[PDB]
Design a protein around this ligand. Structure first.
Ligand SMILES: *[C@@H]1O[C@H](CO)[C@@H](O)[C@H](O)[C@H]1NC(C)=O
Ligand SMILES: *[C@@H]1O[C@H](CO)[C@@H](O)[C@H](O)[C@H]1NC(C)=O
Ligand SMILES: *[C@@H]1O[C@H](CO)[C@@H](O)[C@H](O)[C@H]1NC(C)=O
Ligand SMILES: *[C@@H]1O[C@H](CO)[C@@H](O)[C@H](O)[C@H]1NC(C)=O
Ligand SMILES: *[C@@H]1O[C@H](CO)[C@@H](O)[C@H](O)[C@H]1NC(C)=O
Ligand SMILES: *[C@@H]1O[C@H](CO)[C@@H](O)[C@H](O)[C@H]1NC(C)=O
Ligand SMILES: *[C@@H]1O[C@H](CO)[C@@H](O)[C@H](O)[C@H]1NC(C)=O
Ligand SMILES: *[C@@H]1O[C@H](CO)[C@@H](O)[C@H](O)[C@H]1NC(C)=O
Ligand SMILES: *[C@@H]1O[C@H](CO)[C@@H](O)[C@H](O)[C@H]1NC(C)=O
Ligand SMILES: *[C@@H]1O[C@H](CO)[C@@H](O)[C@H](O)[C@H]1NC(C)=O
Ligand SMILES: *[C@@H]1O[C@H](CO)[C@@H](O)[C@H](O)[C@H]1NC(C)=O
Ligand SMILES: [Ca+2]
Lengths: 7, 746
């Protein structure tokens, strides 16, 4: 599972 | 940062681009080295390593002087020193699309042409002194040998050949033809050498002449036309030639004041002077290359201006080595018997006959009439012909013009008015199609280039002769043995070769359409092949190189690239407790998981001290980490026994660049993070009771941010992919530098 941070 | 320059300094250096690291692909360089008119250029390769190929058809260096042309690759030019025949030396370098070596470092140097390749006109006036330079000190002489080669234009009763005047100015040694002809003037006396040579031998053909003298006997010696002569000059045993004098070409001789129109007219060559008088045995072992003991024919010994120096007396080329050299000519003839004959037969047989009267193998391969105009008599035409002359089997145009111009009587009433002959122009260097770069070629030469991009076989193109207006043109390339990026079919046996070649092209500026073809072939490769470390290290750097491409290039290929990296990690075979595969923008890692003693795990991505590539810490949270993934101890708690036996490994990926994760349905939210991935097998563990702690460092600072923890959902946007918020909330440890996520699935 690829995880990112949206801002 | 320019490799198409003109270098004009007296000496210097140039290297291949990025030397001592590897040159880039697809280079084309033209260093032209130009010296002034009395100099030649000497290059020296200080270092040289190119990609080797048969016929140098991959990367080559061409060294061009005025008369030859030679191609170099491999190591073959490394210790080499080459010399231009004129004053311009040109060095070319071309690399193709893949496989780069170190390149080269070349030193260039302006070298004067030696004095022994030059003859010297002696002057008619004065204040034009052509002397031994004051670098040389002429000793006290009680014996000498002087030799030179002399040749003349005009005649005169009094003329001088050399003059040694002392430090006060009066002449003490001179060779001059006099009232009584050929005489050596020594000190104040006259020693006639007229019985062994005279001024009837001031021919315009050069001939060597040696004069010897000793004080002790008075013995003059003369060497001329192979024979040695001797004579006693008893008056000359009184004199000694003093130190520190001025020796010059022609000069004053036995005169008190002027040298003004008191000199020979003509050429001199190889003027040398020695300390002793030579025997005839010593004069017969005397080559023209032997150095003079006091004065030698060498520029460091003289001050002679440039106004008084003349001159006298597989396939290696990158252009190809054709069997025949072709010329196109334009003949203007006058026919006074136009209604009788056909002048084309008479002209072409006269053309064939004239070159064989000078023993040249030049023949006519085609001729046709272009223009026919009558003149004053209606039966007299001026006819203009276009003709192809072919030179059979030889390794100049104005000589062909002059052998034709010196025979204008072609037939009776047929007369050459004008002829121009042009050497047939090479096909220029030309890229057709893209990545098929064909070099400059002589006519009927076929060139071979590598098939883009696997280079297993060749393509070919021929520089042909248009036999209508006798100009050259490139024929169509034969790419019949060549394969596309897409058209190769991957096996287990060719997977390492395919992946290595695609990893080469991806460093270069690729089109967006080439990039999705490389990423489709990488997906075929990862699917059919069994994966160990060295195969996966090539595949991770195909994907790392597409991460530094433009955002529009990646966007069409990113879901295949993401899915191919994901399956590479599932399929990789490794031997130790863990395996890490690094690149510039992508590090992937696998480590073994024991499902019996699993008490939790913390994994970490970081870049170490003066390392440019990110690494993986499998045990701890490394210092100044960019991504931390903490798996809870209850990760496998709600798993069935069927699922828990399919759990062998922990997978970890860190994406340094974000261009594979584009989302145009984000409501204007920008991704300000690295992307970290993790899994424990071919399946996703869902709905955990204790979350996965995912901590990712931000790309930029953001004071009091509003972060949204997301995961990449491959099912969104008609199974193309997008960020998804579901299951992921923000933990309390998040600041302006990092965000901590608690996600309930992995
Ligand atoms: C190389 O450069 C010189 C000077 O710029 C030019 O005269 C020459 O035609 C060039 N040749 C090629 C093949 O580029
Ligand atoms: C010019 O180059 C050749 C090498 O091909 C070398 O042997 C020769 O000595 C050079 N000329 C001079 C004057 O050094
Ligand atoms: C000119 O020479 C070529 C070379 O063999 C020959 O084939 C040709 O027939 C000659 N032309 C004439 C008109 O004899
Ligand atoms: C490619 O060309 C080289 C010569 O330039 C030749 O030695 C080689 O056999 C060629 N290979 C193929 C597959 O055509
Ligand atoms: C293609 O391959 C054949 C057979 O191997 C060979 O004879 C031919 O010269 C090749 N064509 C080119 C352009 O190299
Ligand atoms: C004549 O030469 C020109 C350019 O050199 C070329 O474009 C043209 O096709 C030639 N003529 C014929 C009839 O082939
Ligand atoms: C190379 O790709 C094109 C793309 O349309 C394809 O049509 C062609 O058949 C391929 N080349 C070969 C030799 O199969
Ligand atoms: C990788 O695997 C292939 C077969 O799958 C094998 O032939 C090759 O020797 C292996 N290479 C290394 C470096 O282990
Ligand atoms: C994981 O499952 C998919 C289909 O569900 C399959 O295509 C893939 O090959 C599997 N991975 C491995 C390593 O067998
Ligand atoms: C997982 O197992 C624990 C204890 O066995 C249980 O309390 C919990 O409800 C389970 N959760 C799910 C989603 O099955
Ligand atoms: C991390 O935070 C410190 C202050 O706490 C700040 O000096 C630094 O610039 C931050 N680094 C980044 C990459 O935002
Ligand atoms: Ca190359």
């Amino acid at each position: 599972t690829h995880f990112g941070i949206l801002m | 940062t320019s490799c198409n320059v003109v270098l004009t300094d007296s000496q210097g250096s140039f290297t291949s681009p990025c030397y001592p690291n590897d040159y880039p692909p697809s280079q084309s360089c033209n260093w032209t080295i130009q010296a002034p008119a009395g100099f030649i250029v000497q290059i020296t390769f200080l270092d040289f390593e190119l990609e080797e190929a048969q016929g140098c058809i991959y990367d080559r260096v061409v060294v061009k002087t005025g008369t030859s042309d030679a191609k170099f690759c491999g190591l073959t030019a490394n210790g080499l020193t080459l010399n231009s025949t004129g004053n311009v030396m040109e060095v070319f370098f071309n690399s193709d699309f893949s496989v780069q070596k170190k390149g080269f470092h070349i030193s260039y140097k302006q070298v004067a042409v030696t004095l022994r390749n030059q003859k010297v006109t002696m002057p008619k006036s004065s204040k034009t002194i052509l002397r031994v330079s004051n670098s040389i000190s002429i000793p006290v002489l009680t014996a000498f040998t002087v030799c030179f080669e002399i040749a003349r234009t005009a005649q005169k009763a009094t003329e001088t050949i050399f003059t040694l005047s002392d430090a006060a100015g009066t002449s003490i040694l001179a060779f001059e033809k006099t009232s009584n002809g050929m005489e050596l003037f020594i000190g104040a006396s006259y020693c006639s050498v007229d019985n062994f040579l005279t001024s009837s031998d001031i021919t315009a053909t050069m001939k060597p002449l040696c004069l010897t003298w000793t004080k002790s006997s008075g013995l003059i010696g003369v060497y001329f036309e192979g024979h040695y002569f001797s004579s006693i000059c008893s008056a000359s045993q009184i004199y000694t030639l003093q130190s520190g004098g001025l020796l010059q070409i022609a000069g004053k001789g036995s005169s008190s004041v002027s040298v003004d129109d008191q000199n020979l007219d003509g050429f001199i060559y190889n003027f040398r002077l020695w300390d002793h008088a030579m025997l005839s045995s010593e004069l017969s072992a005397l080559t023209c290359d032997t150095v003079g003991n006091v004065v030698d024919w060498d520029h460091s010994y003289w001050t002679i201006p440039g106004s008084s120096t003349q001159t006298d007396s597989g396939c290696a080329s990158g252009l190809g080595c054709p069997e025949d050299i072709f010329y196109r000519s334009t003949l203007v003839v006058t026919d006074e018997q136009t209604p009788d004959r056909d002048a084309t037969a008479i002209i072409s047989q006269w053309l064939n006959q004239t070159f064989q009267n000078w023993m040249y193998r030049v023949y006519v391969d085609g001729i046709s009439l272009q223009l026919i105009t009558v003149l004053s008599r209606i039966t007299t035409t001026r006819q203009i012909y276009l003709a192809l002359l072919v030179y059979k089997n030889t390794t100049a145009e104005v000589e062909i013009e002059s052998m034709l111009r010196s025979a204008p009587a072609i037939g009776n009433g047929l007369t050459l008015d004008s002829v121009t002959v042009n050497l047939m122009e090479n096909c220029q260097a030309d890229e057709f199609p893209v990545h098929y770069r064909w070099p400059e070629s002589r006519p009927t030469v076929t060139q071979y280039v590598p098939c883009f991009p696997y280079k297993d076989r060749n393509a070919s193109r021929t520089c042909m002769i248009n036999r209508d207006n006798y100009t050259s043109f490139w024929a169509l390339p034969d790419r019949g043995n060549c394969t596309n990026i897409t058209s190769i079919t991957v096996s287990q046996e060719n997977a390492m070769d395919v992946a290595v070649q695609l990893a080469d092209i991806s460093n270069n500026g690729l089109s967006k359409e080439e990039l999705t073809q490389v990423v489709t072939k990488v997906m075929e490769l990862v699917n059919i092949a069994k994966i160990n470390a060295t195969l996966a290290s090539t595949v991770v750097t195909i994907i790392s190189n597409v991460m530094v491409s433009s955002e529009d290039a990646q966007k069409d290929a990113s879901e295949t690239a993401l899915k191919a990296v994901d399956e590479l990690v599932q399929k990789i075979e490794f031997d130790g407790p863990s395996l890490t595969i690094s690149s510039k923008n992508l590090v992937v890692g696998v480590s073994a998981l024991d499902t019996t003693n699993f008490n939790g795990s913390t994994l970490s991505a970081f870049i170490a001290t003066n390392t440019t590539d990110p690494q993986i810490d499998f045990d701890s949270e490394a210092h100044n980490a960019l991504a931390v993934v903490t798996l809870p101890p209850t990760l496998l708690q709600n798993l069935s026994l069927s699922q828990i036996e399919k759990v062998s490994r922990i997978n970890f990926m860190f994406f340094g660049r974000t261009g594979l994760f584009q989302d145009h349905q984000n409501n204007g939210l920008t991704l300000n993070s690295y992307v970290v991935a993790s899994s424990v097998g071919n399946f996703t563990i869902k709905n955990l009771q204790d979350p996965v702690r995912i901590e990712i460092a931000h790309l930029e600072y953001q004071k009091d941010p509003n972060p949204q923890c997301v995961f990449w959902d491959f099912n969104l946007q008609n199974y193309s992919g997008g960020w998804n918020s579901d299951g992921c909330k923000v933990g309390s440890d998040s600041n302006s530098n990092r965000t901590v996520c608690l996600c309930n699935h992995l």
